[PDB]
Amino acid sequence: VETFGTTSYYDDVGLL
């Protein structure tokens, strides 16, 4: 289900 694999993982960055 969904997609366990894709580019980037913190496009938000500020997420930190």
Partner 1 sequence: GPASVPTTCCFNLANRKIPLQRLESYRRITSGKCPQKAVIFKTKLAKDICADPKKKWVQDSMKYLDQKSPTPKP
Chain residues in the site for partner 1 (CB under 8 A): 2-10, 16
Least separation in angstroms between residue 11's CB and partner 1 is 10
Least separation in angstroms between residue 15's CB and partner 1 is 8
Q: What is the dihedral of CA 7, 12, 15, 16, to 10 degrees?
A: 70
* DSSP single-letter state for residue 9: S
With vertex at residue 1, the alpha carbon angle to CA 5 and CA 11, rounded to the nearest 5 degrees, is 40
Least separation in angstroms between residue 9's CB and partner 1 is 5
